[PDB]
Symmetry: C3
Subunit: 211 residues, 3 copies
């Protein structure tokens, strides 16, 4: 039914308006589904698209491009190799390989090789050894992951973020450095003052002797 194969062997365009352009053992089952080519691909979702080896573009609007990208949650994308989005993980976006989406919530983005999804936390405040930090902006959706535990990735060439009480811009090392220079100066001032207080203490104690 306005379906097209294409060329190759054992290819099936079973979906209405579906297309398999070629390759081997490609099955496009969804309405408006597409397999550009490769081998052992499926595309069961409406308007889905797969190319490469052993992908499953198996939910509506799924994009699965490369090797062994499985998509079974709506409006999701996986490009690269060995990635899986499972049914009821919606709007998940992977550009990466050998990822882990066990903990990826809806809306989450995974970037890079060996990258893991992680559940969003709500961080409005923080307590650091008896000091309270309060009033954090942007305590919301999923997360954006750039690596996994034990295999973290630096983010580089990051522009200086707005530094203010509502800012939700990322901060770079120079901004931390700049605040730390003041902290280091405060700590030296405290020492200078301490020396002064000690000397003042000695003079008082000196004074009563030979009064």
């Amino acid at each position: 039914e306005n379906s097209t194969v294409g060329g190759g062997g054992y290819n099936q365009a079973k979906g209405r308006n579906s297309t398999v352009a070629g390759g081997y053992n490609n099955e496009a089952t969804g309405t408006d589904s597409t397999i550009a080519g490769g081998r052992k691909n499926q595309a069961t979702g409406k308007g889905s698209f797969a190319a490469g080896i052993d992908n499953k573009a198996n939910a509506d609007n799924a994009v699965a491009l490369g090797n062994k990208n499985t998509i079974e949650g709506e409006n999701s994308v996986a490009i690269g190799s060995n990635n899986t989005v499972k049914k009821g993980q919606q709007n998940v976006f992977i550009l990466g390989s050998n990822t882990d989406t066990t903990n990826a919530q809806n809306g989450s983005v995974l970037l890079g090789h060996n990258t893991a999804g992680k559940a969003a936390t709500i961080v409005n405040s923080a307590e650091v050894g008896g000091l309270s930090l309060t009033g954090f902006a942007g305590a919301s959706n999923g997360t954006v992951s750039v690596g996994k535990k034990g295999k973290e990735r630096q983010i580089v060439h990051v522009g200086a973020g707005e530094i203010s009480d509502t800012s939700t811009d990322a901060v770079n090392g120079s901004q931390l450095h700049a605040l730390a220079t003041v902290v280091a100066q405060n700590k030296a001032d405290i020492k200078d003052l301490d020396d002064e207080v000690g000397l003042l203490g000695e003079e008082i104690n000196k004074h009563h002797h030979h009064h």
Copy 2:
């Protein structure tokens, strides 16, 4: 009802597909129109590809500027050298070099060179941040100020960035900072604050001693 007259144009199969551009390809689907030189529609339904060397697949995409890539559902690209992959994304004419991997984004305020990642993500204009005033405290000499932005969410719907490596901490560093680096600096600040209190106690007791001495006169 297919249409492939021009040099090296190909349809493909399906219905109401048109490969009007020189070397253009529509591999199949329904109501796909590839109009640009070297344009390509892999399949799906209601796709356009008016740009040179453009590529669309899925439902209702417009890969309508040079080298546009529009892949999924309802990706409209009308700005040169731009990409949208996912769902309901738009790059307008005069937004160049913009890259979206996401859905239901907002590129109203996105400038040239922006990257949008994720669902409900909004574009934002770059600001120049060379310094900052916190209370009466001045912070200066920030790196990576005076290109577009990289957005990970929208106002009210921000996203944590996780598994970030410790960034270099130096006066020229443009590396992102992670929570353990702010924690480390905060431990020292907390220690300064306690030291201040200890010292304040000591000054008060020294004060009393001075006052007591006058009443030994």
Copy 3:
């Protein structure tokens, strides 16, 4: 050998199960390789995929989509224009244009126009004018790059990161602002104390001349 062209001119589907759906001067040489269309594309890798103008999807599972994306390292992806991954850079993901992968290591991710790759550094500690900061989390492959030197990009709409001794969450401007408010307050407290110590010194010095 289950190969398919497609339409167009000077297209070649030389690989087993390879597909060129159309276009001009496309050569698909790898097993299970695919060229969706365009002009002057190559796909020498197994299960590779190219579309657009002048791409090389020339390593296993390569995805090269747009204009002048060259992939010659395994399991890599480039989408956009003018991007290159050389033989011996594996698992590199580019969504961007006019990038520089000279210094990109394996596993690294490049985002956006004019973006440069950068070697990972190990940052366990830092020394800021006589102050030591230690105990950093997330220190030991590749980096995630958002710009180049001189063309840094701000990251925006970042959620508040966890603030703890092990956190590898990114930090936003409001979190730095929150810490800086306390630093500013420490600094004023130091001034107030300094004034007090000065006055106490005057009392001591005056007293001796009431003797």
